[PDB]
Design a protein around this ligand. Sequence first.
Ligand SMILES: *P(=O)(=O)O/[C]=C(\C(=O)[O-])C1=[C][C]=[C][C]=[C]1
Length: 345
Amino acid sequence: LPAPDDTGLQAVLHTALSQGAPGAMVRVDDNGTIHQLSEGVADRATGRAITTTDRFRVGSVTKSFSAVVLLQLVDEGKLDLDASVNTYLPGLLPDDRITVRQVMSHRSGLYDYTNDMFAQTVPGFESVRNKVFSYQDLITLSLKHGVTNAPGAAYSYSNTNFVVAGMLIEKLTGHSVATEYQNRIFTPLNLTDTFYVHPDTVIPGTHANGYLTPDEAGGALVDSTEQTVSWAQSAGAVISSTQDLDTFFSALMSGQLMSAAQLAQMQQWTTVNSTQGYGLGLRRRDLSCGISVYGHTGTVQGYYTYAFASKDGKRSVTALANTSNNVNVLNTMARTLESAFCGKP
Ligand SMILES: *P(=O)(=O)O/[C]=C(\C(=O)[O-])C1=[C][C]=[C][C]=[C]1
């Protein structure tokens, strides 16, 4: 690979701040050589600087953790990707033909319940932040709506799919998702900054605060740090750090978290758009220089995350801006992948 471009990374973070992120940061693990940059503040009221060691909410990067657990269950003979979800969770879904593989790849047609939660960003946050939902509650909310496409027929990202994932994990193992994450992923990889504390609202240790951008242009930011994340759970509630997400995605792509057969299933790409694919709880992004990278994004309130690795896991990148609902920031932070993998132009 090209050398990572730290000048480029610096410019990306500075641009993100100019667009409304209180803080922005990035760490690159380049085959044993670290790159680390940060600009701005973890806490905009106190002025505490953000750093690459600050913990944060990784949001929908959680889907990759959920997928790893399910694929290990496939390896162990406990789960068949091509069986009906309703084979394992009887009467759960409106269509018995929706399969596990389809849920994990966002091809199920299940309506995304978050549609009905966060259309108004800040009011929706205030509605959910202190609620505790069961998995079934979230499924019921989705099923107030019809499916949006036939089983397997179309890609349509939906949190409902990874609510189903968590129910499958807990059903088939008899354990909580926290226990499964801890025993299958956090402990083996020594992810000392990584937690699943739902429904606790505290982020353990030193962390970036999250700032939700209101829907109204120019509106004051809302501190969204402390919430249950119960609306997401196995779709979005993991806490981590840049070092730990780098370790996780490197381990995944280098073959350490499941059999080769199941990693191949995880990397069967469903088209998202002309430069992106979705596997099983895994994203592919195709970068401008002809490099593809693999990982996931997160957008949980107040935190935009990119965590991606090269195909062999030898270079990994995690970037965080501590705002959300700000597409200028979101698009700018994607440029960290360009600078880190494509290097200087
Ligand atoms: P999650 O709720 O943190 O993130 C949501 C994402 C994502 O994975 O980046 C998303 C993706 C596509 C469409 C809607 C939401």
